[PDB]
Amino acid sequence: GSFELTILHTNDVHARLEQTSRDSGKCTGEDCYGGVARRATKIRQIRASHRNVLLLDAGDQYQGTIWFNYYKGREVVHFMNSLRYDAMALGNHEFDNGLNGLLDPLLKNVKFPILSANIRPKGPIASNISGYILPYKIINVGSEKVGIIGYTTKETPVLSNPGPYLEFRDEVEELQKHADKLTTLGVNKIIALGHSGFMEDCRIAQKVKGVDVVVGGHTNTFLYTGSPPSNEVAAGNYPFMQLSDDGRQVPVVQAYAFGKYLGYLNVTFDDKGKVIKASGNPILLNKSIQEDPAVKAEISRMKVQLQNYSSQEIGRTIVYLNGTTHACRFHECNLGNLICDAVVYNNLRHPDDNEWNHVSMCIVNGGGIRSPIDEQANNGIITLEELTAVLPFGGTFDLLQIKGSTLRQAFEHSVHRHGQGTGELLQVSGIKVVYDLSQKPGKRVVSLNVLCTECRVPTYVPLEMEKTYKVLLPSFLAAGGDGYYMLKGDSSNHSSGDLDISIVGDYIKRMGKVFPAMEGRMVFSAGS
Amino acid sequence: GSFELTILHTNDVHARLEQTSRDSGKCTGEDCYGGVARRATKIRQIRASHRNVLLLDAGDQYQGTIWFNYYKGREVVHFMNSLRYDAMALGNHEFDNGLNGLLDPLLKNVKFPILSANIRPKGPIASNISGYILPYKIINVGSEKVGIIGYTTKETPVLSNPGPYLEFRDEVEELQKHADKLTTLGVNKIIALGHSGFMEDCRIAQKVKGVDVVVGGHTNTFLYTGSPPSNEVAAGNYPFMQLSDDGRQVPVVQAYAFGKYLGYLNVTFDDKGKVIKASGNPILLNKSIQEDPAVKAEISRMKVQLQNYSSQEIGRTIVYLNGTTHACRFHECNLGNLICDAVVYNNLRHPDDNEWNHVSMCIVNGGGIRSPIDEQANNGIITLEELTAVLPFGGTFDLLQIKGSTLRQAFEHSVHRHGQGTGELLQVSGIKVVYDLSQKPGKRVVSLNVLCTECRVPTYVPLEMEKTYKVLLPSFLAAGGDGYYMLKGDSSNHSSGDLDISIVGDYIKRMGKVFPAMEGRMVFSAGSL
Ligand SMILES: *[C@@H]1O[C@H](CO)[C@@H](O[C@@H]2O[C@H](CO)[C@@H](O[C@@H]3O[C@H](CO)[C@@H](O)[C@H](O)[C@@H]3O)[C@H](O)[C@H]2NC(C)=O)[C@H](O)[C@H]1NC(C)=O
């Protein structure tokens, strides 16, 4: 006989609770995409027309919009419960608020298993986190059993805040143990569900004996068979058919990010649990699919709370925060210094092997700073509304691995048309740059010194052209914005981080009073 | 028909709850002083043998030791209630934790009136908190009535945290209004009790018609008639007899600080409320006075509660905090940068007229940095144990008004003996200094730039030699320590600030994780080792 299973899947939704623009920002109202209300409609229609359906999430529901800033995962619990997900693997961002912020609210209130086979808890954490996170789950689907093994990127201690009591083991090694276990228990249909990126997903498909399907995330990979429907370009067919070492074709799927698509894969197994066929395509959640009215009403109710929250005092500034174009696009601006200082602070993580932290530096282009904050306007009170005026686009600050020569090329771009009022000029933290604008464009960087990481006391050292560095930068620049083609990231050198206004808001909340100065992080030499 | 009144008084006790050393630090030796238990004994003995007694405090019970850091004024409430103070005037340090930290615990739980006549509220929160404070109180003493008018220094908004909605008015102007009110209400005996310093106390005695006695504080002034009993040097007789405008002698008293002395003034009034005699002397609270057992027992329990404060994690460092002599006495050290950043942060108020803050700069000599903190030692966890190793002396960071030329002279002193390993080298916040150590001692400063205050965005500007600046500095340097005679403070240019470990601990707790860098705050021209 055969057994047809429909796998619906999401990954890297990243707090897009409401429908979004085409590019996963704020929707204006005419052409909108995604959101949980529209996903609910499509999920319900498929469940009504398809016999055997699993709905899986491959991680990174946490982090991305003010929904996550305020509800802190309560929004994930709520709508993943109401949509009746069958399983979720943990992603790196589920650790952003530490283990306490993962335990409460997500682990204690979801109605479906949370899976990650390659996490090992230590210390007082041990006892029950072992009960809230499972390596795998056997799920009854019709008259059959389907085993789902979870996994989470080994990069999590560097990307997030899992703490000292969590070790992240090799995905292939750990998945192979639980695949053998499932097989020994008689389960012949095994899904690997996890959050380590497309390259690792294909390694799992290739090397883990007994894995039939891999459902991944982390790299926002878009796969599509045929001509795709929106502006995402396919990295390969859907599903991506990876040849295993033992000769089977193993379908690998991911479904981009931000809830724009619902993954949709039809897998036919024979009676021995071997995949005979796997076909489908991610469903674009566009305007043709109605927003479920009951979900929409819950979103609306919760939005009024979010609007009240956005007007609350986070902290105060006792200085003018000069985010005017005349400052941040022409010279050192104290608001840019504050932003990149906040970004560095948010990325302080468990320092391994001879570094006080894995990253010491941040850049933000003046064109990304969209407003000043006037301390005279309202007693210097900073709310999320003021921060949204400065950073209105809902982007993130990401981590980029970059050679010294490329970073120097970026600082030449920073001033190659200085004076024109365009947005290139880089505001910085952990960098000292000296320019000579009297030289020809492309030869204006006099010197670059950076905070060492491989040292016990941070101190400024000359940039080395052949050394590789980590730098924090806005997602806009990591996409090549403002002509920064050399800062464009890919899966091999780039990691997507936290919401910009959440980063800045958290820092202001901690400082209570802010007073950033112009301190000479960039210097314009008078030349000869 | 005379009326004899005994005035017992304290001022600037500054959180010396337990008995202290002779210099008002930790008592380790055989000779201890002060403390509330010893004060209680003497107050009780005087009340038992003297007929008409008032016990007054002229402010600044708040701030000075970890007792205040932990109990946050509950220790003031507890023992001032237990010792049965009759009135207290607010000092600048009672605003250290803001109006909320004054309301709770002090204003809501004292059993005696809190006085300050020259405060004027401007908003609803600052209004209902002032509703707990009175300009004056009439107190029944025997068969007589004594009016007490409070006052608080006008520098409180720069020295402490009252916020922008509490304004401090002129003392003489406001006190004359309430003296006139008391007079019309039939009160002919008036004490001015307040916290503005000895110079202002004498001005009040001289100019406010109807004031009979002034009980002051803020300047830690020691007065004594005859040979004094300890090492404090008297600035004048006790009481100081100030000639008033109307031709009478008005006794002016203060009682040093830190609870070492109990003020003791016997005043005789005639039947019209005129002082016809005033005499006494502050009582040294030394070993000859026993510590009250009940207060001593409560102190001993609170010492045990304080252990929580001393062993709790304040925050963590993820970098080595290099407080070794080899760093902080020879070059920029990241721990010195953190200390002075903490000090500036503690002295932030609100944009006042034309400046974003009244002070932007801090200095600390490397010799005041007494230990590193090793981030490898215990996962970088910082407690009071580690901070006390860095700052073991219980001093403060103070505010000094200084001319640009004098500040530059201090930076020449900073390197006049560089390389010999003594403690002069200045670590800084809000200053960029460049030195050339190959030049002769006294001519090594290449340039000095400082963060402007008179600006909307702080930025570095050249130091101006004839301009007057504010700088934060250790009490050790304000006493001329390490040869810094030009940083010596006096009443006209210097204000004592908060406990050093309280400043640094507060900043570390706020930051949570600290990671100070060497960032080039000082630069040595590239021509020496
Ligand atoms: C925020 O930053 C902008 C950009 O720096 C500031 O505007 C600029 O302010 C400078 C002075 O700080 C002006 O330069 C001076 O202009 C005067 C003429 O009034 C001239 O006499 C001087 O020689 C000097 O060149 C500059 O013109 C001005 N630019 C613009 C476009 O307004 C702004 O002041 C900052 N905001 C705050 C609140 O500090």
Ligand SMILES: *[C@@H]1O[C@H](CO)[C@@H](O[C@@H]2O[C@H](CO)[C@@H](O[C@@H]3O[C@H](CO)[C@@H](O)[C@H](O)[C@@H]3O)[C@H](O)[C@H]2NC(C)=O)[C@H](O)[C@H]1NC(C)=O
């Ligand atoms: C805290 O600060 C002190 C003082 O700067 C640091 O000690 C000094 O560290 C430097 C750099 O390692 C040493 O210079 C180097 O010494 C090595 C070791 O022999 C030698 O190969 C080179 O000639 C080079 O000059 C310097 O000797 C040393 N000074 C002393 C008095 O020990 C210290 O490293 C800092 N602590 C931390 C944890 O960073």
Ligand SMILES: *[C@@H]1O[C@H](CO)[C@@H](O)[C@H](O)[C@H]1NC(C)=O
């Ligand atoms: C908005 O938030 C404030 C503070 O959290 C709260 O006092 C207020 O009731 C909230 N508004 C509503 C409509 O609940």
Ligand SMILES: [Ca+2]
């Ligand atoms: Ca199988």
Ligand SMILES: [Ca+2]
């Ligand atoms: Ca009188």
Ligand SMILES: [Zn+2]
């Ligand atoms: Zn993601």
Ligand SMILES: [Zn+2]
């Ligand atoms: Zn991820």
Ligand SMILES: [Zn+2]
């Ligand atoms: Zn005082």
Ligand SMILES: [Zn+2]
């Ligand atoms: Zn005072």
